[PDB]
Design a protein around this ligand. Structure first.
Ligand code: B7I
Ligand code: B7I
Ligand code: CA
Ligand code: CA
Ligand code: CA
Ligand code: CA
Lengths: 91, 91
């Protein structure tokens, strides 16, 4: 498999490593999202230590108002993070 | 770096491995997009052998009508491919 194909699989793998822990196995609730960010994005994003901070991230990511981040919404999060990285985190 | 962080970097790396070959160094023209798909997505997508086929992919991906796929548009392509893979390529 190419690096791109492996990367695609990694995105799926990390989502399901967190989404399945609690409640709906197909969505990240705020507690799962906090864990994913703190454990898997520690070199790109600041550690989340306050509930208000993860509340704000979920508010941004949750486009259908169910209070959770589904796979489609996670893809949008990935695009945000990747765009930030692409621009050398300048913004 | 986590697998997710490495995956993010891989997405950026593969874009620039193709976008820089011709013309605008920041965008994939159809010829570059064809190369990327045939070389880096050979286990996920059918090989492109006809100009009409890459014309159609670019028509789908090109949201600002410049005839090329920029980084934002590439992210949308990645989301499409990843969603397809996530659903076991059933559709
Ligand atoms: C304020 C809040 N957070 C911050 C902040 C957080 C983190 C940080 O830095 C994080 C560590 C970086 C490690 C990854 C290295 C590779 O990433 C690439 C690879 C290719 C391109 C690229 N782009 C175009 C061509 N190549 C661009 C980036 C900087 C600021 N500041
Ligand atoms: C018609 C046109 N093209 C086709 C077609 C093309 C290619 C193909 O298969 C391609 C090869 C697959 C190799 C990658 C293995 C891992 O990918 C994963 C990993 C996790 C999940 C997942 N999802 C949820 C939980 N885990 C889902 C998928 C099948 C049909 N048919
Ligand atoms: Ca869950
Ligand atoms: Ca949602
Ligand atoms: Ca180019
Ligand atoms: Ca375009």
């Amino acid at each position: 498999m190419s690096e791109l194909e492996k990367a695609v699989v990694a995105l799926i793998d990390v989502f399901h490593q967190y989404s399945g822990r609690e409640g709906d196995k197909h969505k990240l609730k705020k507690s799962e999202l906090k864990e994913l960010i703190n454990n898997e994005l520690s070199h790109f994003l600041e550690e989340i230590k306050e509930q208000e901070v993860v509340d704000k991230v979920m508010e941004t990511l949750d486009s259908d108002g169910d209070g959770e981040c589904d796979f489609q919404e996670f893809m949008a999060f990935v695009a945000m993070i990747t765009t930030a990285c692409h621009e050398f985190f300048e913004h």
